[PDB]
Amino acid sequence: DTGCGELVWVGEPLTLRTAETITGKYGVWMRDPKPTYPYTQETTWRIDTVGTDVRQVFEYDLISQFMQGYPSKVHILPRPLESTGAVVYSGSLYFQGAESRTVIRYELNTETVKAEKEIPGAGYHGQFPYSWGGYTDIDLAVDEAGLWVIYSTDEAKGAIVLSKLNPENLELEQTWETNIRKQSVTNAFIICGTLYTVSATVNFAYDTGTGISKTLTIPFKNRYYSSMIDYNPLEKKLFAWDNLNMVTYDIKLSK
Ligand SMILES: [Ca+2]
Ligand code: NA
């Protein structure tokens, strides 16, 4: 099976690159599931996120360049970025502005800010982080249906809220409220419209198509806790960052 389904298994972490400074103890790395010319499914981006003025986005045309640590281009964001929640989708980096609830769409090839929007009511900067902290209040996500944001609000009393985002202008299209305390999980990601969390196990699922939540006990092996765990719907794999290590996981879905 190569299409959508429920997550039933996660493999062992594979380390693709280890960061060589403590600035990269935590970070985000990713590929675009809907690559826009001139990028391809091999293009990789990396951001080392320790510090207070994070602006450099490393871009690698080839996986070989990413694995040897030699960027083909460095983008300098026009404003500082917060935490590890950013994603790339359809040619744009979507990231959170430092010390804000603002999500910014930055078109990578043209180096152009295309949109900026507050996520209504979202906590930020240490209000509803994932368990380990890192100011991980706001976590963007891509699945087979496009762009989402994972956050919480005072209205939700710290439970995970997720919203589908319009990728062009960042407007919220639809919002769901779960019963999972965001501060109680290590990270979260969306696969085939279901939110999954990692405690280690994949321990909760919330299906946006039905509104039904499930407890799970799928083993999740950490290379060494993850500061970032995202899903790539083109590869159908998890991408993670664990103590300097940029890691990927095979998964199995069952329809
Ligand atoms: Ca995530
Ligand atoms: Na994310």
UniProtKB/Swiss-Prot annotation:
Effect caused by changing T112I: In GLC1A; likely benign; no significant effect on protein stability
Protein localization: Secreted
Effect on the protein of changing V247I: In GLC1A; uncertain significance
Binding-site residues for Ca(2+), renumbered to this chain: D139, N187, A188, I229, D230
Effect the entry attributes to changing P120S: In GLC1A; uncertain significance
UniProt effect for mutating S254P: In GLC1A; uncertain significance
Shown residues in whole-protein numbering: 242 to 503 of 504
Start and end residues of each Olfactomedin-like domain: 3-255
This protein's name: Myocilin, C-terminal fragment
Domain of life (superkingdom): Eukaryota
Reported effect, T136K: In GLC1A; uncertain significance
Effect on the protein of changing V88M: Slightly decreased protein stability
Annotated consequence of substituting R31G: In GLC1A; uncertain significance
Effect upon mutating G3V: In GLC1A; uncertain significance
Result after altering E20K: In GLC1A; uncertain significance
Stated consequence of mutating I229N: In GLC1A; induces stress fiber formation in only 5% of cells
Outcome recorded upon mutating D139A: In GLC1A; incomplete penetrance; inhibits endoproteolytic processing; mainly accumulates as insoluble aggregates inside the endoplasmic reticulum
Consequence of substituting I218M: In GLC1A; uncertain significance
Annotated S-S bridges: C4-C192
Chain location of the short sequence motif Microbody targeting signal per the record: 254-255
Outcome following mutation: E82K: In GLC1A; inhibits endoproteolytic processing; mainly accumulates as insoluble aggregates inside the endoplasmic reticulum
Reported impact of S152N: In GLC1A; uncertain significance
Effect upon mutating E59K: In GLC1A; uncertain significance
